[PDB]
mmCIF file of N, CA and C in Angstrom:
data_model
loop_
_atom_site.group_PDB
_atom_site.id
_atom_site.type_symbol
_atom_site.label_atom_id
_atom_site.label_comp_id
_atom_site.label_asym_id
_atom_site.label_seq_id
_atom_site.Cartn_x
_atom_site.Cartn_y
_atom_site.Cartn_z
ATOM 1 N N UNK A 22 -11.509 5.147 -12.244
ATOM 2 C CA UNK A 22 -11.077 3.675 -12.992
ATOM 3 C C UNK A 22 -9.585 3.730 -13.116
ATOM 4 N N UNK A 23 -8.781 5.164 -12.984
ATOM 5 C CA UNK A 23 -7.308 4.639 -12.461
ATOM 6 C C UNK A 23 -6.644 4.613 -11.135
ATOM 7 N N UNK A 24 -5.740 5.298 -10.623
ATOM 8 C CA UNK A 24 -5.485 5.195 -9.347
ATOM 9 C C UNK A 24 -4.760 6.415 -8.634
ATOM 10 N N UNK A 25 -4.946 6.695 -8.036
ATOM 11 C CA UNK A 25 -4.045 8.116 -7.868
ATOM 12 C C UNK A 25 -3.286 8.122 -6.675
ATOM 13 N N UNK A 26 -1.972 7.583 -7.123
ATOM 14 C CA UNK A 26 -1.082 7.140 -6.063
ATOM 15 C C UNK A 26 0.137 8.331 -6.462
ATOM 16 N N UNK A 27 0.420 8.594 -5.301
ATOM 17 C CA UNK A 27 1.804 9.697 -4.841
ATOM 18 C C UNK A 27 2.918 8.929 -4.642
ATOM 19 N N UNK A 28 4.002 8.906 -4.583
ATOM 20 C CA UNK A 28 5.259 8.335 -4.393
ATOM 21 C C UNK A 28 5.571 9.734 -3.323
ATOM 22 N N UNK A 29 5.860 9.060 -2.315
ATOM 23 C CA UNK A 29 6.419 10.388 -1.348
ATOM 24 C C UNK A 29 7.573 10.061 -0.708
ATOM 25 N N UNK A 30 8.642 10.615 -0.524
ATOM 26 C CA UNK A 30 10.032 10.563 0.117
ATOM 27 C C UNK A 30 9.943 11.433 1.360
ATOM 28 N N UNK A 31 10.527 10.710 2.208
ATOM 29 C CA UNK A 31 10.336 10.828 3.781
ATOM 30 C C UNK A 31 11.693 11.212 3.783
ATOM 31 N N UNK A 32 12.405 12.680 4.438
ATOM 32 C CA UNK A 32 13.597 13.159 4.913
ATOM 33 C C UNK A 32 13.278 14.418 5.334
ATOM 34 N N UNK A 33 13.737 14.595 6.419
ATOM 35 C CA UNK A 33 13.873 15.667 7.368
ATOM 36 C C UNK A 33 14.308 16.881 6.702
ATOM 37 N N UNK A 34 15.291 16.747 5.649
ATOM 38 C CA UNK A 34 16.282 17.649 4.539
ATOM 39 C C UNK A 34 15.562 17.942 3.718
ATOM 40 N N UNK A 35 14.954 16.542 3.085
ATOM 41 C CA UNK A 35 14.364 16.632 1.406
ATOM 42 C C UNK A 35 13.227 16.164 1.549
ATOM 43 N N UNK A 36 12.044 17.095 1.580
ATOM 44 C CA UNK A 36 10.652 16.557 1.273
ATOM 45 C C UNK A 36 10.179 16.638 0.018
ATOM 46 N N UNK A 37 9.762 15.523 -0.720
ATOM 47 C CA UNK A 37 9.362 15.469 -1.894
ATOM 48 C C UNK A 37 7.998 14.731 -2.354
ATOM 49 N N UNK A 38 7.584 15.145 -2.928
ATOM 50 C CA UNK A 38 6.169 14.246 -3.581
ATOM 51 C C UNK A 38 6.488 13.755 -5.147
ATOM 52 N N UNK A 39 6.477 12.721 -5.557
ATOM 53 C CA UNK A 39 6.780 12.443 -7.009
ATOM 54 C C UNK A 39 5.289 11.900 -7.364
ATOM 55 N N UNK A 40 4.524 12.251 -8.305
ATOM 56 C CA UNK A 40 3.096 11.483 -8.707
ATOM 57 C C UNK A 40 3.821 10.547 -9.992
ATOM 58 N N UNK A 41 3.308 9.556 -9.294
ATOM 59 C CA UNK A 41 3.702 8.267 -9.908
ATOM 60 C C UNK A 41 2.892 8.031 -11.248
ATOM 61 N N UNK A 42 3.689 8.472 -12.320
ATOM 62 C CA UNK A 42 3.232 8.268 -13.716
ATOM 63 C C UNK A 42 2.648 7.028 -14.134
ATOM 64 N N UNK A 43 3.952 6.054 -13.726
ATOM 65 C CA UNK A 43 3.424 4.823 -13.927
ATOM 66 C C UNK A 43 3.236 3.855 -12.633
ATOM 67 N N UNK A 44 1.818 3.784 -13.026
ATOM 68 C CA UNK A 44 0.615 2.711 -11.754
ATOM 69 C C UNK A 44 1.730 1.705 -11.771
ATOM 70 N N UNK A 45 2.431 1.827 -10.431
ATOM 71 C CA UNK A 45 3.150 1.066 -9.777
ATOM 72 C C UNK A 45 2.225 -0.199 -9.058
ATOM 73 N N UNK A 46 1.169 0.019 -8.618
ATOM 74 C CA UNK A 46 0.410 -0.480 -7.394
ATOM 75 C C UNK A 46 0.540 -0.908 -6.339
ATOM 76 N N UNK A 47 1.596 0.024 -5.750
ATOM 77 C CA UNK A 47 2.198 -0.489 -4.329
ATOM 78 C C UNK A 47 1.364 0.979 -3.417
ATOM 79 N N UNK A 48 0.351 0.332 -2.930
ATOM 80 C CA UNK A 48 0.092 1.548 -1.748
ATOM 81 C C UNK A 48 -0.614 0.743 -0.671
ATOM 82 N N UNK A 49 -0.620 1.302 0.648
ATOM 83 C CA UNK A 49 -1.610 0.313 1.438
ATOM 84 C C UNK A 49 -2.948 0.778 1.424
ATOM 85 N N UNK A 50 -3.101 2.563 1.080
ATOM 86 C CA UNK A 50 -4.371 2.544 0.597
ATOM 87 C C UNK A 50 -4.388 3.912 -0.123
ATOM 88 N N UNK A 51 -5.844 4.770 -0.772
ATOM 89 C CA UNK A 51 -5.757 5.957 -1.251
ATOM 90 C C UNK A 51 -5.389 6.562 0.051
ATOM 91 N N UNK A 52 -6.194 6.430 0.721
ATOM 92 C CA UNK A 52 -6.367 7.626 2.210
ATOM 93 C C UNK A 52 -5.016 7.575 2.562
ATOM 94 N N UNK A 53 -4.464 6.225 2.633
ATOM 95 C CA UNK A 53 -3.409 6.395 3.482
ATOM 96 C C UNK A 53 -2.103 7.129 2.859
ATOM 97 N N UNK A 54 -2.366 7.067 1.560
ATOM 98 C CA UNK A 54 -0.974 7.929 0.672
ATOM 99 C C UNK A 54 -1.299 9.254 1.079
ATOM 100 N N UNK A 55 -2.637 9.698 1.033
ATOM 101 C CA UNK A 55 -3.001 11.094 1.118
ATOM 102 C C UNK A 55 -2.740 11.631 2.697
ATOM 103 N N UNK A 56 -3.615 10.910 3.458
ATOM 104 C CA UNK A 56 -3.540 11.371 4.837
ATOM 105 C C UNK A 56 -1.927 11.216 5.151
ATOM 106 N N UNK A 57 -1.135 10.504 4.910
ATOM 107 C CA UNK A 57 0.232 10.539 5.251
ATOM 108 C C UNK A 57 1.423 11.448 4.556
ATOM 109 N N UNK A 58 0.750 11.801 3.429
ATOM 110 C CA UNK A 58 1.541 12.888 2.452
ATOM 111 C C UNK A 58 1.077 14.365 2.991
ATOM 112 N N UNK A 59 -0.161 14.414 3.086
ATOM 113 C CA UNK A 59 -0.401 15.917 3.857
ATOM 114 C C UNK A 59 0.185 15.787 5.440
ATOM 115 N N UNK A 60 0.164 14.738 6.213
ATOM 116 C CA UNK A 60 0.317 14.979 7.488
ATOM 117 C C UNK A 60 2.176 15.457 7.152
ATOM 118 N N UNK A 61 2.820 14.528 6.565
ATOM 119 C CA UNK A 61 4.433 14.774 6.275
ATOM 120 C C UNK A 61 4.548 16.392 5.826
ATOM 121 N N UNK A 62 3.701 16.331 4.953
ATOM 122 C CA UNK A 62 3.623 17.962 3.952
ATOM 123 C C UNK A 62 3.430 18.969 5.358
ATOM 124 N N UNK A 63 2.766 18.801 6.352
ATOM 125 C CA UNK A 63 2.513 19.892 7.450
ATOM 126 C C UNK A 63 3.723 19.670 7.892
ATOM 127 N N UNK A 64 4.504 18.899 8.386
ATOM 128 C CA UNK A 64 5.979 18.809 9.452
ATOM 129 C C UNK A 64 6.497 19.213 8.646
ATOM 130 N N UNK A 65 6.821 19.145 7.058
ATOM 131 C CA UNK A 65 7.827 19.299 6.205
ATOM 132 C C UNK A 65 8.117 20.975 6.058
ATOM 133 N N UNK A 66 6.701 21.966 5.825
ATOM 134 C CA UNK A 66 6.429 23.334 6.072
ATOM 135 C C UNK A 66 7.161 23.706 7.184
ATOM 136 N N UNK A 67 6.485 23.097 8.278
ATOM 137 C CA UNK A 67 6.582 23.414 9.497
ATOM 138 C C UNK A 67 8.210 23.654 10.228
ATOM 139 N N UNK A 68 8.886 22.348 9.881
ATOM 140 C CA UNK A 68 10.322 22.294 10.261
ATOM 141 C C UNK A 68 11.516 23.228 9.188
ATOM 142 N N UNK A 69 10.420 23.385 8.272
ATOM 143 C CA UNK A 69 11.377 24.142 7.160
ATOM 144 C C UNK A 69 11.963 23.317 6.524
ATOM 145 N N UNK A 70 11.705 22.211 6.115
ATOM 146 C CA UNK A 70 12.138 20.820 5.055
ATOM 147 C C UNK A 70 11.622 21.233 3.748
ATOM 148 N N UNK A 71 12.692 21.512 2.969
ATOM 149 C CA UNK A 71 12.800 21.510 1.468
ATOM 150 C C UNK A 71 11.795 20.752 1.055
ATOM 151 N N UNK A 72 10.629 21.665 0.060
ATOM 152 C CA UNK A 72 9.549 21.196 -0.564
ATOM 153 C C UNK A 72 10.075 21.160 -2.090
ATOM 154 N N UNK A 73 9.754 19.562 -2.260
ATOM 155 C CA UNK A 73 9.862 19.584 -4.153
ATOM 156 C C UNK A 73 8.627 18.748 -4.703
ATOM 157 N N UNK A 74 8.063 19.437 -5.187
ATOM 158 C CA UNK A 74 6.781 18.888 -6.107
ATOM 159 C C UNK A 74 6.736 18.590 -7.828
ATOM 160 N N UNK A 75 7.022 16.890 -7.774
ATOM 161 C CA UNK A 75 7.289 16.766 -8.909
ATOM 162 C C UNK A 75 6.042 15.937 -9.121
ATOM 163 N N UNK A 76 5.231 16.348 -9.747
ATOM 164 C CA UNK A 76 3.917 15.593 -10.599
ATOM 165 C C UNK A 76 3.850 15.757 -11.681
ATOM 166 N N UNK A 77 4.382 14.530 -12.353
ATOM 167 C CA UNK A 77 4.063 14.754 -14.174
ATOM 168 C C UNK A 77 2.389 14.631 -14.811
ATOM 169 N N UNK A 78 2.088 15.477 -15.348
ATOM 170 C CA UNK A 78 0.992 15.456 -15.742
ATOM 171 C C UNK A 78 0.511 15.447 -17.424
ATOM 172 N N UNK A 79 -0.404 16.226 -18.029
ATOM 173 C CA UNK A 79 -0.216 16.593 -19.622
ATOM 174 C C UNK A 79 1.246 17.008 -19.958
ATOM 175 N N UNK A 80 2.180 17.421 -19.460
ATOM 176 C CA UNK A 80 3.157 17.599 -19.906
ATOM 177 C C UNK A 80 4.223 16.567 -20.207
ATOM 178 N N UNK A 81 3.732 14.883 -19.996
ATOM 179 C CA UNK A 81 4.075 14.152 -20.428
ATOM 180 C C UNK A 81 4.328 13.381 -21.588
ATOM 181 N N UNK A 82 4.383 14.240 -22.537
ATOM 182 C CA UNK A 82 3.920 13.778 -23.614
ATOM 183 C C UNK A 82 4.725 12.489 -24.011
ATOM 184 N N UNK A 83 6.200 11.948 -23.543
ATOM 185 C CA UNK A 83 6.524 10.632 -23.793
ATOM 186 C C UNK A 83 6.069 9.669 -22.981
ATOM 187 N N UNK A 84 5.488 9.768 -21.840
ATOM 188 C CA UNK A 84 5.282 8.919 -21.158
ATOM 189 C C UNK A 84 3.430 8.620 -21.259
ATOM 190 N N UNK A 85 3.380 8.508 -22.394
ATOM 191 C CA UNK A 85 1.783 8.385 -22.800
ATOM 192 C C UNK A 85 0.673 9.173 -21.864
ATOM 193 N N UNK A 86 1.119 10.273 -21.699
ATOM 194 C CA UNK A 86 0.500 11.173 -20.473
ATOM 195 C C UNK A 86 0.409 9.961 -19.570
ATOM 196 N N UNK A 87 1.033 10.161 -18.133
ATOM 197 C CA UNK A 87 0.566 9.635 -17.105
ATOM 198 C C UNK A 87 -0.170 9.864 -16.103
ATOM 199 N N UNK A 88 -1.329 10.662 -16.498
ATOM 200 C CA UNK A 88 -2.016 10.799 -15.598
ATOM 201 C C UNK A 88 -2.935 9.887 -14.647
ATOM 202 N N UNK A 89 -3.494 9.054 -15.813
ATOM 203 C CA UNK A 89 -4.413 7.955 -14.798
ATOM 204 C C UNK A 89 -5.387 8.294 -13.318
ATOM 205 N N UNK A 90 -5.191 9.762 -13.110
ATOM 206 C CA UNK A 90 -5.741 10.011 -11.672
ATOM 207 C C UNK A 90 -7.401 10.144 -11.491
ATOM 208 N N UNK A 91 -7.916 9.338 -11.716
ATOM 209 C CA UNK A 91 -9.482 9.175 -11.691
ATOM 210 C C UNK A 91 -9.884 8.011 -11.272
#
């Protein structure tokens, strides 16, 4: 029903995943996002890239629950 889009940041020094709490609608494909995200994540940990996990969920009371991931 919703759209599981994760906003990924690409940096060999600062790698981070942001859960798009506000459905932007900009994504090439669901698999493309996960595929690239996990692929980049592997490289990140592999090279010692800092890992930042920012995925708001049920804790986002102010953002009227920015979940919509289904």
